[PDB]
Amino acid sequence: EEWYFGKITRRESEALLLNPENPRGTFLVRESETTKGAYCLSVSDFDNAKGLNVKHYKIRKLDSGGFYITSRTQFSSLQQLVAYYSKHADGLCHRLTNVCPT
Numbered sequence: 001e002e003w004y005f006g007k008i009t010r011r012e013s014e015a016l017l018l019n020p021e022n023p024r025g026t027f028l029v030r031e032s033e034t035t036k037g038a039y040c041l042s043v044s045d046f047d048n049a050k051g052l053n054v055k056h057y058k059i060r061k062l063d064s065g066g067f068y069i070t071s072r073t074q075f076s077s078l079q080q081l082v083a084y085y086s087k088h089a090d091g092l093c094h095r096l097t098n099v100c101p102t
């Protein structure tokens with residue numbers, strides 16, 4: 001239940017997002033399974049080559065500071081990241097739209 005999904009798997013994230021009900025920009029935030037201390041923004045997309053597909057963006061945190069996907073654009077928290085990208089794609093595949101249901 002969203003937007004923070006905590007310790008779900010990459011593949012489980014993907015199975016959730018890829019519900020055909022879900023529009024482009026459907027998203028969740030999870031822990032990164034593989035980088036410890038990182039988080040992950042997982043977003044549903046579409047192209048006519050791949051069809052329905054998902055992109056994953058690592059969210060790093062500086063020790064000393066803020067959260068980021070790109071290091072020139074930082075946030076003092078995860079809700080501020082999410083609020084930003086809800087208004088602007090700014091290099092993401094798509095603007096954040098629905099939170100992932102379930």
Ligand SMILES: CC(=O)N[C@@H](Cc1ccc(OP(=O)(O)O)cc1)C(=O)N[C@@H](CCC(=O)O)C(=O)N[C@H](CCC1CCCCC1)C(N)=O
Pocket residue numbers: 009010031032033034035040055056057058069070090091092
């Ligand atoms: C295999 C994979 O998904 N890697 C992920 C990263 C990841 C790793 C571990 C995670 O943790 P976990 O193991 O739990 O999933 C979660 C996510 C990945 O590279 N995404 C791509 C972007 C999505 C895509 O275009 O696909 C990525 O960073 N692009 C970078 C940077 C691109 C830019 C684009 C402009 C805005 C700032 C980012 C690159 N190439 O310069």
